[PDB]
Amino acid sequence: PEKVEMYIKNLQDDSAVVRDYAAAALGKIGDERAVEPLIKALKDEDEYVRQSAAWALGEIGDERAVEPLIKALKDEDPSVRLTAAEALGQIGGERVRAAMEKLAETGTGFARKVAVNYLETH
Amino acid sequence: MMNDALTSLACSLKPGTTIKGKWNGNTYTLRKQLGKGANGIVYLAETSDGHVALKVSDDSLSITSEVNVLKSFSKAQSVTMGPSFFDTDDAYIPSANTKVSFYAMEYIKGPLLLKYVSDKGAEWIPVLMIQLLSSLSVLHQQGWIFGDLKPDNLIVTGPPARIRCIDVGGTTKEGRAIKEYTEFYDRGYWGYGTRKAEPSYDLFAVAMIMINSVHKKEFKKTNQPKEQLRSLIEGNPLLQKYKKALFSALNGDYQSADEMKKDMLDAGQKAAQ
């Protein structure tokens, strides 16, 4: 309802507690209008907010999140990395496998490990 | 159930029992007991607005202390592991013939830390320890030391994965003496220092929690505890990876949780490249 719009607006709140709650809520609701706002929240200053946005994007399953989530594999925060890796798995499908294939080739570190292990499990 | 008061309270309070706050007038209907200890009894309780976890004690001082700990968490600029605080009040329990004090907090459920990492994988262990360290930094900056920090008191909610503490009993003001502790997680037991409430006490416990999370059991010290712990850490692929943080926490190298967090982040970064 107007809850979805409230939570999308709350992603711009000064409080990280409020932004985090909103990101998670939008993931549960599953509405598509939240995808672009959540992609922006992947760059939040707060690591919990980024983790919630990553999870929420995987939960929605909209493939607009695939390349932003791949970038999140480089996040300094390990909760964000694991959650993003998990989110890519949740979205799944050929486009993700396509990206992992590329990533396994021209990637490094964790992101490469994620790609390599994704390809081995598909 | 430790003193006569609390044990009599425990026998007194039944599902269906209602407790009404003296000062604020909120009514809590007990549904089931969640937990029992020296610091009080915890119930799932129903209100007109839903459900809460309700902690009840004859000791108003410890109830007030715990309330202020939860309030300290709630002042953080970010999320923390602590449950939200809702209410605190006194009440008279006619059956137990005693005045009691209580507080209501967020009811949270989820697998214990050890169950979570067993199910989702060991890679989550340092991740959840970093969340734990972030929350301890909040507490420490407010002058509180967790003290009896142990895995049975930590659950993981989500998704997304969040470590949470389910009881703050025994949190202690910095500078005072920690009196509530568990041997395996206790600096003093292992011969590595005092039970002074200071950040480094909590950091020792974090190291032991990570060791328990990997090893999946507790064990007694031997005659050579330092070599015992060194051997266990170095012999395990995951603990070895984080040995700088773990050894520094055991040895008292750190003054703040942020320093341990930094070393854990760095060890993770190296692998993540």
Author numbering:
A (entry chain B): 3 to 124
B (entry chain A): 1 to 273
Extract from the study:
In B. subtilis, only three Ser/Thr kinases of the Hanks family have been identified to date: PrkC, PrkD/YbdM, and YabT (Kobir et al., 2014). YabT lacks an extracellular sensing domain, but it is linked to the membrane via a C-terminal transmembrane helix (TM). Interestingly, the basic juxtamembrane region of the protein has been shown to be involved in DNA-dependent activation of YabT (Bidnenko et al., 2013).
An original approach using a fusion with an artificial protein scaffold as crystallization helper was developed. Crystallization assays were performed with the short form as well as with the long form of the bE8-YabT(∆TM) fusion protein. Both crystallized in similar conditions and yielded identical crystals diffracting at high resolution in space group P21212, with one molecule of YabT(∆TM) and one bE8 binder in the asymmetric unit. The YabT catalytic domain displays the classical bilobal architecture of Hanks-type kinases. The nucleotide-binding site located in the cleft between the two lobes is empty. The DNA-binding region (residues 274–315) is disordered and not visible in the electron density map. The bE8 binder, which displays the classical αREP fold (Urvoas et al., 2010), interacts as expected with YabT(∆TM) through its concave face. From the kinase point of view, the interaction mainly occurs through residues Arg162 from loop β6–β7, Gln131 from helix αE, and Ser78 from loop αC-β4. In particular, residues Glu66 from helix αC and Lys55 from strand β3 form the conserved salt bridge considered as a signature of the active kinase conformation.
